[PDB]
């Protein structure tokens, strides 16, 4: 069957994690 | 063995035998098209009707590549050898550059007419040591 | 009909957002680093 | 005089005379025996 | 230095002169004496008439002043060798530039320090593998 | 002038030139599409270039074959100019250094020391070949196209 | 600012100073050549890097070298 | 005056003009040139960059999975993979009108959508992923893996977890771990996955994370692995009548070696791929036990290098360990070279030995993947050379590598460059002469005089592997060679796959292939010549014997000494980029035209027109553009309209680069000064003062921007042609 609607919303909440960790690594690399 | 099985001689090729009856005339001779039909009918052909040449080194097609290769190399060695010898001859006359710009015809012709023995002259200059130079005596750039 | 996929109210906001987000911030960042200046 | 014999023997005049002579050779040879894709 | 005395040259104004940054940041002035009243080309454009005697002109950068100086002594029979180039600050601070020690930098002169002088050949510069990770260049050492 | 001559060549073929019927009607070559197709770059790319260039590439085997030959030849010279227009002589002199070493290895170096073209001459050869290739291409194209309209 | 150096191969001919258009280069008395002088670069702050000195050098390869560096308002040749 | 942009280089910060911005960006990743950068902080910043980059790659793959499982017709395409066009992603453009709306509502989707041409549907259905939920689970797993690597980088940037410089400079352990684990264990685990999921899924058996612990991939378990007899896994292989995804014609074998092509999917066999990965995993694990570590037994690379000397090479490879181990540019130049060669190899292998089911039939995906990988490799090789030039500029030590094989390359660099020039002339002259001769001979109504050279040396190699269309009777083409009577299990499949006139496995070549191959040889020799003269003469020459003191990339040296334009080792890279792009244009024209001939069954067109250039200019460029330029017309708009727009767009960018490449700076500096005066005198505008003093683009930046526009207009235009002209006659 196709993909659910709430799982697409679960995708952004999980994608919050790589964004945040990449922000941390980015600010750590600026030094 | 059956080398070049996908190639049939122009004498047997279908499209070639179809096109050979309708060959154009290059020079003023009207037979030149039929002359080509009779002349190229000996080479190997492809399924399209155009002759092919095999240069892998076999003597069956020594007229395809071997003869022009040798004839070129002869004439080209002639050219380069008379040029090199005339360039060396200039290096002892007045102004080595002016005579490179203005040609000494009585000298350039004398060196051109003595170029048909350029292999023997080159081997005699290599055995004596005139053909090549020494690395420790050539201007080089910083490494 | 635009959105034959699940959660069709996301692609909308996602396209405008990237529209007025990333290059806006990018062009503003260079500006801000030009701001420190130095009157001596 | 030699002033014109030196001009007729300059680099461009001679390099065009040789090219004209070689053109004549090649053109006449491919007039009398044209279409030599290889050697028979 | 103390005062910049000089008459402004006869010129009908041009758009190639100094600008707002050239007045607020820094501008350059050149003072010279003319033996008579003649016409000279402007480094910014056009042809102007220099006044008889002490002259004064303000320009944007230093190269313009030196380009006018190299023109003054070469084109006119009463050659001008007393042209003095000054740099002007936004606080009125004026300092001497060209000529440096009163003598043109062309010919030698006593009382100058060796600046940028090296005691080697260019083919004797050190290898960049020996100075890497250090804030120095093969020519700075 | 590249746009001027194309404006001329397409407006004439579309809204002017054309065969006239014995009744009085006039049917233009490109069927009068200039007023309706020359307004977009794709119109000039397709209905002008791609459409009217067919006479030049299909000219082999006829009396107009020389025009296709010169079309490709101008396409060649155009690109040949880019080598000069995009590079600088400092690389070519360093290469001539290696070739001079090679010539002195067999002791065949001219007393006239070879030097790459000056910067100005590099630019001059570049622009000369650019114009030559472009104008040869357009000349061949225009002649092969105009001779093939009856 | 650009860096200007002068090497011991200099013959002291003042040509690089006669070609300099910004009074960057001078001449100081030396003890290496017949002219007993060597090129000097005290006012590197006025050096734009037009290489007019290096063009006017006679020795086998340059005796004066210019190495471009951190460009400033004066080195960029800004007149506006 | 200095401000704060950038914070890693004071020289670029002190610039009071607009250049301060530009060089602040183009020196972002040049860590070696930062202020006070030490050798350890360098490697550590680079390590964290590696972590972040692995995370970026995994995030891109996660998005690729997400859009397929979300907006793609994966399940439908599984039903009819030879007639249903795959779906890449859905369109959300508020600018469409009516033609594009009616057109892009395609591929079974009820909305304007974009067809997929990256060939990922075939990969996913060949793996065993048959439902969108498996793709979604994989996407979530990759979204977690990327965060894993991001946190790994962030944590290793901490001083307690900061790896030591001696840890980074460890070569005898990094190799033993990358081969036995990153290459061996990875290949072994992938083979296990192929056996446990792919093979059962090919037989209708669903094996997921909910039953793989109990369902064996073979009727006989792990005990027959321990049995010295292994023929039981050859078992009954999948018959020639096997059908993918069903248990019809399926056997019980998992590790075979019968070779050939699957007659239905026209691809490789799954058991063969798993067996291959198992064998090479054993090989790589064995390789991972060569260099010594903390247990004495093992090799030392520094000894092996310094021990291979030579009577004609002097010092051989001495001190090369301490040389390469300390030069990051050396390592990067070797890595880029090897990776580019294997990328070109991947390209040159996937088009004739496809491993994914029903991927050979889709012509647009297969035409796109090959060209994609070839352009990738064409950038990788230029990088390998550009970094070798930087090794010579920054890391070459003439006392450490004294008299070794590396210094002798510099000692005879004139001869190397000279012979490269000779062979490039010897190629170019005759290849161009033969092409022009064929054109002149065909234009005169005499097609019976074309110099058509038969590629004997390559057709004979084809015969050495089983190609009988030429009939050389050599090695595998001869039934009596001892190479055929070896009882090899793969021979019957290989011999059937090679000679069937339906596949791309060793295509029949002729004189056109010969001439285009010699044009390709010219494109390789000349590009390598440029990239090698740029690297050798990167430390000095006779025009600039002190080039080493000026670094790698610098504008020039001045108009003196005759002229010094484009004299740095960076300018040689800038020049060789054009040659790489030209070679990759020639190669792609060759591939696309011959594959059009093979796909339409009209190999005669290519074999009979590729000998003269007009055939390319007409029967390929002009002929295959008809649909391309007809994407949007005054009569309608079809699905090719976006490609018809991108074609002209690429032309525009490519022509824009010509401005930066032909006109140079000073003109633009004067034209900018005029505008500065214009603004500082305009009322209601001089009160709008600028902090950044506007300046014209530098010469280096000029060449860089021009080359970038050229490359964009070179890639995008040819891609809009290659995809549009392919998705019409066959898509
Ligand atoms: C006496 C003339 C002469 C001789 C003996 C040579 C010999 C050689 N050249 Mg050379 N060359 C010449 C003139 C000559 N050149 C001229 C005039 C040019 C400027 C166009 C060049 C430019 C050139 C390049 C760029 C290169 C060579 C190279 C080479 C070497 C390899 C051969 C080759 O590349 O194939 C053939 C050579 C060419 C196609 C170059 C053109 C040859 C000219 C047109 C022939 C000269 C004829 C001369 C006027 C005869 C004078 C007769 C006298 C009685 C008046 C070789 C030893 C290559 C090298 O470096 O070595 C590996 C190489 O890269 N040459
Ligand atoms: C890293 C590769 C990648 C790329 C190139 C794209 C590109 C795109 N995504 Mg996407 N996305 C990705 C990864 C990626 N995504 C991942 C890993 C997820 C899972 C969290 C998503 C989840 C996602 C959603 C839910 C949506 C998009 C949408 C889009 C489109 C609108 C632009 C946008 O705002 O994106 C998204 C910005 C951040 C994810 C665009 C073509 C929108 C769309 O469908 O456009 C039609 C949309 O609704 N993406
Ligand atoms: C540089 C490569 C090259 C080579 C190897 C050849 C070789 C050949 N060409 Mg050719 N040609 C070339 C370039 C080349 N050409 C180019 C660039 C052009 C365009 C100007 C031509 C235009 C051309 C024409 C118009 C003709 C040839 C012809 C020939 C053949 C005649 C040989 C001959 O005259 O007998 C030996 C010569 C002396 C002993 C020969 C096999 C002739 C032919 O009929 O082909 C079979 C002929 O008519 N060529
Ligand atoms: C079996 C153990 C093991 C494994 C599986 C790996 C795996 C990996 N290492 Mg690694 N490494 C190991 C042990 C291991 N290493 C040890 C013991 C050392 C100390 C010498 C290193 C030191 C090391 C360094 C310095 C770097 C890596 C890097 C990498 C990654 C290669 C880049 C990539 O992802 O491309 C694809 C992989 C296969 C196609 C890769 C995932 C690189 C990296 O990306 O940084 C994270 C890198 O810079 N490793
Ligand atoms: C693993 C791939 C890789 C990596 C890590 C690097 C890394 C680097 N490259 Mg590089 N390069 C690569 C591949 C790579 N390159 C390839 C494939 C090419 C050919 C297209 C190049 C061609 C190249 C050139 C010509 C130059 C660099 C330069 C650099 C350095 C500065 C880059 C920068 O910040 O500019 C800006 C980044 C974005 C605008 C940097 C350490 C520069 C340098 O100074 O070398 C030290 C430079 O001159 N690279
Ligand atoms: C169609 C455009 C074009 C052409 C024809 C060439 C041709 C060439 N390039 Mg080149 N290049 C180009 C574009 C082009 N480039 C561009 C855009 C760039 C980026 C700026 C480069 C950058 C580049 C670099 C960096 C290098 C080259 C080199 C070369 C030479 C390699 C030698 C060879 O190929 O053998 C044979 C030569 C040819 C096939 C061309 C000669 C064709 C003529 C017609 C032959 C006959 C002579 C003719 C009759 C003369 C009489 C004229 C008369 C009518 C007045 C060659 C002459 C390399 C080099 O110098 O070689 C050592 C080199 O390093 N190129
Ligand atoms: C390129 C496409 C096909 C074109 C024709 C091939 C020629 C290519 C041009 C190269 C010219 C070689 C000039 C030699 C220059 C030369 O004479 O050097 C001299 C050298 C003598 O070395 P020594 O005996 O001192 O060796 C001691 C070593 O320890 C080195 O320190 O002889 C050779 O190296 C012979 C092998 C050539 C090695 C160079 C190329 C090798 C080709 C690739 C080999 C692959 C083998 C398998 C690897 C996986
Ligand atoms: C077997 C043969 C071919 C195969 C050919 C083989 C593979 C080619 C081998 C080439 C070898 C590697 C090179 C040969 C010689 C290399 C030496 C260094 C030649 C040096 C020539 C120089 C010294 C000559 C100099 C001066 C000579 C003497 C005369 C000139 O005027 C002027 C000038 C150039 C100054 C193939 C391609 C397979 C086709 C087949 O049908 C026939
Ligand atoms: C305790 C243990 C045992 C039992 C182990 C059991 C019971 C399970 C073991 C599983 C193991 C050990 C490894 C499993 C690894 C699975 C991996 C590594 C999957 C990696 C996926 C990657 C990397 C990315 C895949 C991708 C995705 C997500 C996509 O969707 C697109 C394609 C691609 C990008 C490839 C035994 C006794 C047996 C041996 C001793 C140790
Ligand atoms: C600049 C520089 C550099 C360089 C780099 C490079 C350039 C690399 C590369 C490379 C490459 C690019 C290579 C290639 C190659 C080739 C090869 C390696 C080959 C081969 C062969 C073989 C071995 C084969 C065999 C066989 C056959 C014949 C077929 C069948 C199979 C068999 C196997 C049998 C460096 C950084 C180092 C340093 C600095 C300087
Ligand atoms: C190739 C190249 C060179 C080298 C160019 C050279 C050496 C010119 C070669 C001329 C040869 C020697 C003569 C051949 C051309 C003749 C003018 C044609 C006359 C033919 C008649 C005799 C029939 C530069 O000097 C240069 C300078 C600045 C930017 C780019 C470049 C550049 O790209
Ligand atoms: C036009 C031109 C200029 C002038 C160019 C200028 C002043 C640049 C103006 C471009 C502005 C900044 C807009 C560019 C828009 C870009 C697409 C933005 C990209 C920047 C990224 C951060 C996104 C040169 O300075 C020059 C120098 C040397 C050779 C040729 C030329 C040349 O052709
Ligand atoms: S580089 Fe130019 S401006 Fe600088 S000192 Fe030399 S000549 Fe004068
Ligand atoms: Ca499954
Ligand atoms: Cl249109």
Swiss-Prot record, chain B:
Pfam families cross-referenced by the UniProt entry: PSI_PsaF
One annotated Gene Ontology cellular component of this protein: photosystem I reaction center
InterPro entries cross-referenced by the UniProt entry: PSI_PsaF, PSI_PsaF_sf
Biological processes, Gene Ontology terms: photosynthesis
Keywords attached to this entry: Photosynthesis, Photosystem I, Signal
Superkingdom in the source lineage: Bacteria
Gene3D superfamilies for this protein: Photosystem I PsaF, reaction centre subunit III
SUPFAM superfamilies, sorted: Subunit III of photosystem I reaction centre, PsaF
PANTHER family per record: PHOTOSYSTEM I REACTION CENTER SUBUNIT III, CHLOROPLASTIC
Function: Probably participates in efficiency of electron transfer from plastocyanin to P700 (or cytochrome c553 in algae and cyanobacteria). This plastocyanin-docking protein contributes to the specific association of plastocyanin to PSI.
Family recorded in the similarity comment: Belongs to the PsaF family.
Protein's recorded name: Photosystem I reaction center subunit III
Species in which this protein is naturally found: Synechocystis sp. (strain ATCC 27184 / PCC 6803 / Kazusa)
Phylogenetic classification of the source organism: Bacteria, Bacillati, Cyanobacteriota, Cyanophyceae, Synechococcales
Gene: psaF
UniProtKB/Swiss-Prot annotation, chain C:
A Pfam family reported for this protein in Swiss-Prot or TrEMBL: PSI_8
Transmembrane feature ranges: 12-32
Transmembrane among keywords: yes
Keyword field contains Transmembrane helix: yes
GO biological process, one term: photosynthesis
Membrane topology recorded in Swiss-Prot or TrEMBL: Single-pass membrane protein
Primary location recorded for the protein, binned into one broad class: membrane
GO cellular component terms, semicolon-separated: photosystem I; plasma membrane-derived thylakoid membrane
Signal peptide range in chain numbering: none
Subcellular location: Cellular thylakoid membrane
InterPro entries listed in its UniProt record: PSI_PsaI, PSI_PsaI_sf
Keywords of this entry: Membrane, Photosynthesis, Photosystem I, Thylakoid, Transmembrane, Transmembrane helix
Family label: Belongs to the PsaI family.
Protein purpose: May help in the organization of the PsaL subunit.
NCBIfam families from the UniProt entry: PRK11877.1, PS_I_psaI
Name of the molecule in the record: Photosystem I reaction center subunit VIII
Organism from which the protein derives: Synechocystis sp. (strain ATCC 27184 / PCC 6803 / Kazusa)
Species classification: Bacteria, Bacillati, Cyanobacteriota, Cyanophyceae, Synechococcales
UniProtKB/Swiss-Prot annotation, chain D:
Highest taxon in the source lineage: Bacteria
SUPFAM superfamilies per the UniProt record, alphabetical: Subunit IX of photosystem I reaction centre, PsaJ
InterPro entries documented for this protein: PSI_PsaJ, PSI_PsaJ_sf
Keyword Mitochondrion: no
Gene Ontology CC annotations of this record: photosystem I; plasma membrane-derived thylakoid membrane
Transmembrane segments: 7-27
Coarse class of the protein's main subcellular location: membrane
Membrane topology summary: Single-pass membrane protein
Subcellular location: Cellular thylakoid membrane
Keywords: Membrane, Photosynthesis, Photosystem I, Thylakoid, Transmembrane, Transmembrane helix
Pfam families in UniProt: PSI_PsaJ
GO BP, sorted A to Z: photosynthesis
Family assignment from sequence similarity: Belongs to the PsaJ family.
Function: May help in the organization of the PsaE and PsaF subunits.
Name of this protein: Photosystem I reaction center subunit IX
Source organism: Synechocystis sp. (strain ATCC 27184 / PCC 6803 / Kazusa)
Swiss-Prot record, chain F:
Subcellular location: Cellular thylakoid membrane
Residues holding chlorophyll a': 75
Binding site for chlorophyll a: 83, 91
Binding site for phylloquinone: 92
Transmembrane segments: 64-86, 124-144
Assembly behavior: The PsaA/B heterodimer binds the P700 chlorophyll special pair and subsequent electron acceptors. PSI consists of a core antenna complex that captures photons, and an electron transfer chain that converts photonic excitation into a charge separation. The cyanobacterial PSI reaction center is composed of one copy each of PsaA,B,C,D,E,F,I,J,K,L,M and X, and forms trimeric complexes.
Its job: PsaA and PsaB bind P700, the primary electron donor of photosystem I (PSI), as well as the electron acceptors A0, A1 and FX. PSI is a plastocyanin/cytochrome c6-ferredoxin oxidoreductase, converting photonic excitation into a charge separation, which transfers an electron from the donor P700 chlorophyll pair to the spectroscopically characterized acceptors A0, A1, FX, FA and FB in turn. Oxidized P700 is reduced on the lumenal side of the thylakoid membrane by plastocyanin or cytochrome c6.
Entry similarity comment: Belongs to the PsaA/PsaB family.
This protein's name: Photosystem I P700 chlorophyll a apoprotein A1
Organism: Synechocystis sp. (strain ATCC 27184 / PCC 6803 / Kazusa)
Full protein stretch here: 602 to 751 of 751
């Amino acid at each position: 069957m196709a993909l659910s609607d709430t799982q697409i919303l679960a995708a952004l909440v999980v994608a919050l994690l790589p964004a945040f960790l990449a922000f941390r690594l980015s600010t750590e690399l600026y030094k | 063995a059956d080398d070049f099985a996908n190639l049939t001689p122009c004498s047997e090729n279908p499209a070639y035998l179809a096109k050979s009856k309708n060959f154009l005339n290059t020079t003023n001779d009207p037979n030149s098209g039929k002359i080509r039909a009779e002349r190229y009918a000996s080479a190997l052909c492809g399924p399209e009707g155009y002759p092919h040449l095999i240069v892998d080194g076999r003597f069956t097609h020594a007229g395809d590549f071997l003869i022009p290769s040798i004839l070129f190399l002869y004439i080209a060695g002639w050219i380069g050898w008379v040029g090199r010898s005339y360039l060396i001859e200039i290096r002892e006359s007045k102004n080595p550059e002016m005579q490179e710009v203005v040609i000494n015809v009585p000298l350039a012709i004398k060196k051109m007419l003595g170029g048909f023995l350029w292999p023997l002259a080159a081997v005699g200059e290599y055995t004596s040591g005139k053909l090549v130079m020494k690395d420790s005596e050539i201007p080089t750039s910083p490494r | 009909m635009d959105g034959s996929y699940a959660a069709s109210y996301l692609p909308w906001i996602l396209i405008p957002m990237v529209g007025w987000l990333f290059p806006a911030v990018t062009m503003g960042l260079l500006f801000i680093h030009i701001e420190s200046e130095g009157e001596g | 005089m030699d002033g014109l014999k030196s001009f007729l023997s300059t680099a461009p005049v001679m390099i065009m005379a040789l090219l004209t002579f070689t053109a004549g050779i090649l053109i006449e040879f491919n007039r009398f025996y044209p279409d030599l894709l290889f050697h028979p | 230095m103390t005062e910049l005395s000089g008459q402004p040259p006869k010129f009908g104004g041009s758009t190639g002169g100094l600008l707002s940054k050239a007045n607020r940041e820094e501008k350059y002035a050149i003072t010279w004496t003319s033996a008579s009243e003649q016409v000279f080309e402007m480094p910014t454009g056009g042809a102007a008439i220099m006044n008889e005697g002490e002259n004064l002109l303000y320009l944007a950068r230093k190269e313009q002043c030196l380009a006018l100086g190299t023109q003054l002594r070469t084109k006119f029979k009463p050659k001008i060798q007393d042209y003095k180039i000054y740099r002007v600050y936004p606080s009125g601070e004026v300092q001497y530039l060209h000529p440096a020690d009163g003598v043109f930098p062309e010919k030698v002169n006593e009382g100058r320090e060796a600046q940028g002088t090296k005691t080697r050949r260019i083919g004797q510069n050190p290898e960049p593998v020996t100075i890497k990770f250090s804030g120095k260049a093969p020519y700075e050492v | 002038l590249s746009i001027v001559i194309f404006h001329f060549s397409w407006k004439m073929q579309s809204d002017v030139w054309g065969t006239v019927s014995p009744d009085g009607s006039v049917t233009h070559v490109t069927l009068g599409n200039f007023a309706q197709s020359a307004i977009t770059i794709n119109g000039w790319l397709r209905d002008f270039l791609w459409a009217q260039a067919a006479n030049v590439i299909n000219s082999y085997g006829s009396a107009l074959s020389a025009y296709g030959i010169m079309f490709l030849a101008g396409h060649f010279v155009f690109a040949f100019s880019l080598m000069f227009l995009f590079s600088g002589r400092g690389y070519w002199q360093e290469l001539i250094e290696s070739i001079v070493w090679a010539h002195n290895k067999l002791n065949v170096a001219p007393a006239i020391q070879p030097r790459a073209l000056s910067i100005i001459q590099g630019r001059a050869v570049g622009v000369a070949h650019y114009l030559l290739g472009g104008i040869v291409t357009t000349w061949a194209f225009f002649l092969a196209r105009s001779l093939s309209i009856g | 600012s650009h860096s200007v150096k002068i090497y011991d191969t200099c013959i002291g001919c003042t040509q690089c100073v006669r070609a300099c258009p910004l009074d960057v280069l001078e001449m100081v008395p030396w003890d290496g050549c017949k002219a007993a002088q060597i090129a000097s670069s005290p006012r590197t702050e006025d050096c734009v890097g037009c290489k007019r000195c290096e063009t006017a050098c006679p020795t086998d390869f340059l005796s004066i070298r210019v190495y471009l560096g951190a460009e400033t308002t004066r080195s960029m040749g800004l007149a506006y | 005056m200095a401000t704060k942009f950038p914070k890693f280089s004071q020289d670029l910060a002190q610039d009071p003009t607009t250049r301060r911005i530009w060089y602040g960006i183009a020196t972002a990743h040049d860590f070696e040139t930062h202020d006070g950068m030490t050798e350890e902080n360098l490697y550590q910043k680079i390590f964290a960059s590696h972590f972040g980059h692995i995370a970026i790659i995994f995030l891109w793959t996660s998005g690729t999975l997400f859009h397929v499982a979300w907006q793609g017709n994966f399940e439908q395409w599984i039903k009819d993979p030879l007639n249903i066009r795959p779906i890449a992603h859905a369109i959300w453009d508020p600018h469409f009108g009516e033609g594009a709306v009616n057109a892009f509502t395609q591929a079974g989707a009820s909305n304007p959508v974009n067809i997929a041409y990256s060939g990922v549907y075939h990969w996913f259905y060949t793996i065993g992923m048959t439902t969108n939920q498996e793709l979604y689970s994989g996407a979530v797993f990759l979204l977690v893996l990327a965060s894993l690597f991001l946190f790994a980088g962030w944590l290793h940037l901490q001083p307690k977890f900061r790896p030591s410089l001696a840890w980074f400079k460890n070569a005898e352990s990094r190799l033993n771990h990358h081969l036995a684990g990153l290459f061996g264990v990875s290949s072994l685990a992938w083979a296990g996955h192929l056996v446990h999921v792919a093979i059962p899924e090919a037989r209708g058996q669903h094996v997921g994370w909910d039953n793989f612990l109990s369902t064996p991939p073979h009727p006989a378990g792990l005990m027959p692995f321990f049995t010295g007899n292994w023929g039981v896994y050859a078992a009954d292989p999948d018959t020639a009548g096997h059908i993918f995804g069903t248990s019809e014609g399926a056997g019980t074998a998992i590790l075979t070696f019968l070779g050939g092509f699957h007659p239905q999917t026209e691809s490789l066999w799954l058991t063969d791929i798993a067996h291959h990965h198992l064998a090479i995993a054993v090989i790589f694990i064995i390789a991972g036990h060569m260099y010594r570590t903390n247990w004495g037994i093992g090799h030392s690379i520094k000894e092996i290098l310094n021990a291979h000397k030579g009577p004609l090479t002097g010092a051989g490879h001495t001190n090369l360990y301490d040389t390469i181990n300390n030069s990051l540019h050396f390592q990067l130049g070797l890595a880029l070279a090897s990776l580019g060669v294997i990328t070109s190899l991947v390209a040159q292998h996937m088009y004739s030995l496809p491993s994914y089911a029903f991927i050979a039939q889709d012509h647009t995906t297969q035409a796109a993947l090959y060209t994609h990988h070839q352009y990738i490799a064409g950038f990788l090789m230029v990088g390998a050379f550009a970094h070798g030039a930087i090794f010579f500029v920054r890391d070459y030590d003439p006392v450490a590598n004294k008299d070794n094989v590396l210094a002798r390359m510099l000692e005879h660099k004139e001869a190397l460059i000279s012979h490269l020039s000779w062979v490039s002339l010897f190629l170019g002259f005759h290849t161009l002469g033969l092409y022009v001769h064929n054109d002149v001979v065909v234009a005169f109504g005499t097609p019976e005089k074309q110099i058509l050279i038969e590629p004997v040396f390559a057709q004979w190699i084809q015969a050495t592997s089983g190609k009988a269309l030429y009939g050389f009777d050599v090695l595998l083409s001869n039934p009596d060679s001892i190479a055929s009577t070896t009882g090899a299990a793969w021979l019957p499949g290989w011999l059937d796959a090679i000679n069937s006139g339906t596949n791309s496995l060793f295509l029949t070549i002729g004189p056109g292939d010969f001439l285009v191959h010699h044009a390709i040889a010219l494109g390789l020799h000349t590009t390598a010549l440029i990239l090698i003269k740029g690297a050798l003469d990167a430390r000095g020459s006779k025009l600039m014997p002190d080039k080493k003191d000026f670094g790698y990339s610098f504008p020039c040296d001045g108009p003196g000494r005759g002229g010094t334009c484009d004299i740095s080792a960076w300018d040689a890279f800038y020049l060789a980029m054009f040659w790489m792009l030209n070679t990759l244009g020639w190669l792609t024209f060759y591939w696309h035209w011959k594959h059009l001939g093979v796909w339409s069954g009209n190999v005669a067109q290519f074999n009979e027109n590729s000998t003269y250039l007009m055939g390319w200019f007409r029967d390929y460029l002009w002929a295959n553009s008809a649909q391309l330029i007809n994407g949007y017309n005054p009569y309608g708009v079809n699905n090719l309209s976006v490609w018809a727009w991108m074609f002209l767009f690429g032309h525009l960018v490519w022509a824009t680069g010509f401005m930066f490449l032909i006109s140079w700076r000073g003109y633009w500096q004067e034209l900018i000064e005029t505008i500065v005066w214009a603004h500082e005198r305009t009322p209601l505008a001089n009160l709008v003062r600028w902090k950044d003093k506007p300046v014209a683009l530098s010469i280096v930046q000029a060449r860089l921007v021009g080359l970038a526009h050229f490359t964009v207009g070179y890639v995008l235009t040819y891609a809009a042609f290659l995809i549009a002209s392919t998705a019409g006659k066959f898509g």
